[PDB]
Amino acid sequence: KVIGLEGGIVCLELGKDVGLRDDEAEGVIGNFNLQVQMTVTNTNQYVTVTP
Amino acid sequence: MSNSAIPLNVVAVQEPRLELNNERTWVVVKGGQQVTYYPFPSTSFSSNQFNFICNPPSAQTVLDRLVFIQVPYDITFTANPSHAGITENLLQPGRDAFRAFPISSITNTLNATINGFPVNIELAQIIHALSRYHTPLKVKNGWMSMQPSFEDNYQSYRDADGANNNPLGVFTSAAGLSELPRGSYTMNVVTNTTTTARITGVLYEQVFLPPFLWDGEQAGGLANLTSLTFNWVLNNNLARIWSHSDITNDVSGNSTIGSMNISFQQPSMYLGFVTPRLNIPIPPRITYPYFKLSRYTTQFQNTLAPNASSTFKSNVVQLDSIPRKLYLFVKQSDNVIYQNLNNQITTPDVFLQINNLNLTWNNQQGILSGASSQNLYDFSVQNGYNKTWSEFNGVTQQFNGVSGQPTKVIGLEGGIVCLELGKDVGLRDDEAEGVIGNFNLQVQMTVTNTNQYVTVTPDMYIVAVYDGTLVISNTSAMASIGVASKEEVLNARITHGVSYNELQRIYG
Secondary structure: OOOOOOOOOOOOOOOOOOOOOOOOOOOOOOOOOOOOOOOOOOOOOOOOOOO | OOOOOOOOOOOOOOOOOOOOOOOOOOOOOOOOOOOEEEOOEOOOOOOOEEEEEEOOOOOOOOEOOOOEEEEEEEEEEEOOOOOOOOOOOOOOOOOOEEOOOHHHHOEEEEEEEEOOEEEEEOOOOOHHHHOOOOOOHHHHOOHHHOOOOOOOOOOOHHHHOOOOOOOOOOOOOOOOOOOOOOOOOOOEEEEEEOOEEEEEEEEEEEOOOOOOOOOOOOOOOOOOOOOEEEEEEEOOOOOOOEEOOHHHOOOOOOOOOOOOEOOEOOOEEEEEEOOOOOOOOOOOEEEEEEEEEEEEEEEOOOOEOOOOEEEEOOOOEEEEEOOOEEEEEEEEOOOOOOOOOHHHHOOOOOEOEEEEEEEEOOOOOOEOOOOOHHHHOOOOOOOOOOOOOOOOOOOEEEOOOOOOOOOEEEOOOOOOEEEEOOOOOOOOOOOOOOOEEEEEEEEEEEEEOOOOOOOEOEEEEEEEEEEEEEEEEOOEEEOOOOOOOHHHHOOOOOOOOOOHHHHOOOOO
């Protein structure tokens, strides 16, 4: 028996693993955009997860 | 040099094979870093609408001018009884295609709002006559190639079979390095038997209307907008996308196809945004050229054919300001070909052959009135027409070698005159190519139906493009029309730097 255990929840600090063009830091305003295209797998055996 | 009459000035030029000196300056080409493309899938798609509301990423990033959309689609055909039967596949090797350009003529109107003040155009009737007008072979094998792109050149589809330039054939049978026919275009055929066909794929149609550009040649895209958004609406019928041939429909009928239906999925636009680099700053507000084209249209009651002639005039209109140039043609009418759909799928686009055209600018009456139909085809081709003489004035004899079968005459599809409005219409002293206003127009033009079968009620169309400034400064979009003053048009000193040919280069 294969058991689903849970999922990752990644978090990337904005200066740390994103990198920001010079003159940018966690305070500074403003107006930028973000969109996350991300592939995933349902692990749970029993039910269909509508995501 | 100073030998003749009034003496001239000497200059010498080196032949190409040798300068060998001149001043050779190394030129570093630079453009901002980060050019990226997004696919904005339309929010609120429907069966009679598409709406793509997308926002510029930073509002400090210039937006490139070419834009296009892609729609996945699905059609089911089915055979009517009678005509029946019937024993051939409902889709035929040489007698079947998309109309060009498909997802265009099908759409009733398109309006994109920038920044946002709306700029919208009429895509159903405008475009089919706008296509002929500015594209060289260089272009019709470039950007224009993403959608079916081969225009109807036979007065009747039935005749075409089987030519080497039948406007809707297989890819094999278009001679090397030329524009293919519209049965070239790729798409899955899930089924195809007698009584049923069913096809699927995806078509890329680029948007027209300024300032988005369908020429290949490019110019600085619109920054610094804060939000833009397109909005189609398609007219009801939707049977206009497909095309057909009479050659298979034969009978007391009637035909093989009637009827069939379409289905769309998630369409999406495709925008592109460069970023300029932090060294070179672009101005806070900035001015763009901007064109608007809007068609005026009469309808008549008189029915003329199969090759008989007559004469027509069109209700006066009052232009606010001189269009920079206007087009005029008589096409087969709308009131027909929107009934009993077999007509919709089997009538080509083509216009009737012109005999002569006299028109009136403000108060003049009878302009051009004595210019031979031949002499109308001289301009354009000087404003960029692009079809051989025999195509304009469409008629073509082609005879049969036996005793005794009379020679067969085909309509070769008619012509469409475009007269650039200062270039060869002439305007009173101190009147520019676009100043307010306001001057009547009235087009009196005799025509002949050259299509062998059958009769046709016609309509007249006259599409006038105006030339306005448009200043997009965030976040306002003022758009003054008639930019030059009547006093400024007198004594605006001529220049010898600019070439007029370079201005007719910038479409348009």
